[PDB]
Design a protein around this ligand. Structure first.
Ligand code: 7TJ
Ligand code: 7TJ
Ligand code: TF3
Ligand code: TF3
Ligand code: MG
Ligand code: MG
Ligand code: MG
Ligand code: MG
Lengths: 344, 344
């Protein structure tokens, strides 16, 4: 077969980050043929870039069953996409079987996270969990997961639009507060199920330039939901367990600020907090992988990748003895919301 | 002369970080001879370590008048200290002229900050202000200033004690709130002088393990004052200028938390804040050097060195459109308060 030639050829290209605008433009008025011709070039570049990095991992990592299985998904997905390079954009059955091919590729990779998690486990027990190992895992998974988010975003844009308010997974009129409430509601439901107390929510908005207006943005609200949900679940765990022997339960307080450049979402809790020393660990794939609410959500590392993905960030800071603020930093202006892709 | 042999010899040694305990022990019951024999070894190691680093700077930096002048102070101070190596600890005139020598050395170096500032200016205008330059300046000055804080601390411990509550510059019973109030009071005074409005203060304490108790610690309260004062001055500037056309002026809110491991001091303002993109810049010697309240205080970079100096930190996070939290993280337990010295 040809996977290594394909990988080599296509990793000579640089991925092409898209902006929100570019996304919205692909997504109306059936630009279908256009999405197609972009994607058949772009997905291989993206796939191959990460595949090259996978192949450069040391052999004692690369020969593990978990990496072998993922190496195998990428090869197959890259080949499935190949089939279409020389095919004819005007032929509607071409467009059709390409959408089928996208769905199948998306399915094939649904379980990477737990797959990678086993590889981390194997390596931790097999070579150790020293700081150097940790940085290398962190470095590799951040890139790899960031890479993964970007590909799933391309595929979802195409399959949702090519099967009027929403544009695939982008809401050009996202109501930030609405998403905060829904993710709160869902985390509370879980909370009340496993603890039979749950804190209230208090939302405050600060729309600097327009005192009055509800705060809206162009965003991928499924992403924003992932991040809010992870954050609520942690804050609820903290708050509830830290107040078992007490009567008053602090609310969880969220602030939504709209500046010239940032849209920031702070979520404050009084769960007793974490010492500065132990904070980075929460972001570590290595330390946050071991063999109640613990089962739910995308995790802090991935939540932060979602924020970084459109040039934002997710940060924590705590006051041990008191509680923790978690802030999601997003770009307020759609013209600043451009894909951030691992550097090659 | 012998400066380069001395530098080489003494940079073969590693500085010896001291803990609060070690500091308190030198500082009572006249351990004077002991402080003397420690210092005559330790100061040269410390001086020489930084001097070695100064000599490794590229020539286009090293040949500048500002660096030449500082290179010259260190040489002289290292030599003044040399005079004592073979001298006799039992002779009281020895002890005496050594204290004189310490005072003189401290004076000789009083003006490094503005000296270094001219070197940064020269280099910025002479070679540019690109990101690489910036990291190298940051790296060098952090180390150099951290080095400087540690030496001044040794000298001040000796000269204050060898000329009962306080122990030189260490207060084994520092009242954190007291220092917050005093630095607030001083920053307000300045504020009212240049603006004729100034925000109020609100202090809240959270003593996790002892709900009741005022929060106390073993610290160098002059340091804690430097950091609180810089932070108040910024928060007052922000708050006041951001509310000129408005009637209500938010207070500046400080929280003092005492955990198992951290003592944290958060100072919150509603000055409108800073976008995430521009935050690191506030810590940059390069960008925060250009040719009202602006004249006062030690600066953010040095304030953070003071916090790092005893294994703590100083961090900022803002919500553009709203305001800024600044948190000083200190070690709650004196057994964790050990000098952090630049690595060699
Ligand atoms: C990482 C994580 C994953 N899943 C779940 Cl359910 N929780 C966490 C989690 C949650 C809170 C924390 N802590 C530390 C913490 C841990 C446990 C507790 C509960 N208290 C106790 O267990 C105690 F035993 F002391 F009583 C409080 C705080 C925080 O301070 C915190 C961190 C992130 C965040 O977004 C929000 C936060 O509040 C750490 C881990
Ligand atoms: C670094 C510094 C040094 N000296 C002085 Cl007097 N001030 C500052 C300073 C202060 C505040 C900021 N800003 C940004 C800022 C700058 C200006 C203003 C005032 N508003 C305006 O000038 C406006 F023009 F928009 F109205 C508000 C915020 C902050 O958000 C902030 C930073 C650190 C800190 O500890 C506290 C802070 O509040 C930046 C620089
Ligand atoms: C399965 C995934 C999560 C995973 C598991 C484990 C790893 C571990 O990766 C390491 C560990 C140590 C070193 C230093 C070193 O030895 N360098 C020289 C090259 N051998 C390099 C790498 Cl790439 C990465 C990704
Ligand atoms: C005066 C103080 C504040 C000061 C002023 C200026 C500097 C600047 O230092 C630089 C700038 C660029 C580089 C890259 C490079 O050229 N590397 C190869 C070696 N030439 C290295 C260094 Cl050490 C430091 C400290
Ligand atoms: Mg598309
Ligand atoms: Mg963080
Ligand atoms: Mg001493
Ligand atoms: Mg910071």
């Amino acid at each position: 077969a040809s996977a290594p030639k394909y990988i080599e050829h296509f990793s000579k290209f640089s991925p092409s980050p898209l902006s929100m605008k570019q996304f919205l433009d692909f997504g109306s008025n059936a630009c279908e043929k256009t999405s197609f011709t972009f994607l058949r070039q772009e997905l291989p570049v993206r796939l191959a870039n990460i595949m090259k990095e996978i192949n450069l991992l040391p052999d004692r990592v690369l020969s593990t069953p978990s990496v072998q299985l993922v190496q195998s998904w990428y090869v197959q997905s890259l080949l499935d996409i190949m089939e279409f390079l020389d095919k004819d954009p005007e032929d509607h059955r071409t467009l059709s079987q390409f959408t089928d091919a996208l769905v199948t590729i998306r399915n094939r990779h649904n379980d990477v996270v737990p797959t990678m998690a086993q590889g981390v486990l194997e390596y931790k027990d097999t070579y150790g969990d020293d700081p150097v190992s940790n940085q290398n895992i962190q470095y590799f998974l951040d890139r790899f997961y960031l890479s993964r988010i970007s590909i799933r975003m391309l595929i979802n844009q195409h399959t949702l639009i090519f099967d009027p308010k929403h544009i695939g997974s982008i809401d050009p009129n996202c109501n930030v507060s609405e998403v905060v409430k829904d993710a709160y509601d869902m985390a509370k439901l879980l909370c009340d199920k496993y603890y039979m107390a749950s804190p209230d929510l208090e939302i405050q908005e600060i729309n600097a330039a327009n005192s009055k207006q509800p705060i809206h943005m162009v965003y991928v609200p499924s992403h924003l939901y992932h991040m809010l949900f992870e954050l609520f679940k942690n804050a609820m765990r903290a708050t509830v367990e830290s107040h078992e022997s007490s009567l008053i339960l602090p609310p969880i307080k969220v602030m939504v600020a709209l500046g010239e450049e940032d849209l920031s979402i702070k979520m404050s809790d009084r769960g007793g907090g974490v010492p500065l020393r132990k904070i980075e660990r929460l972001f570590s794939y290595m330390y946050s992988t071991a063999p109640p609410l613990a089962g739910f959500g995308y995790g802090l590392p991935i939540s932060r990748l979602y924020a970084k993905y459109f040039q934002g960030d997710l940060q924590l800071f705590s006051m041990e003895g008191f509680g923790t603020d978690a802030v999601i930093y997003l770009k307020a202006l759609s013209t600043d919301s451009v894909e951030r892709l691992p550097v090659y």
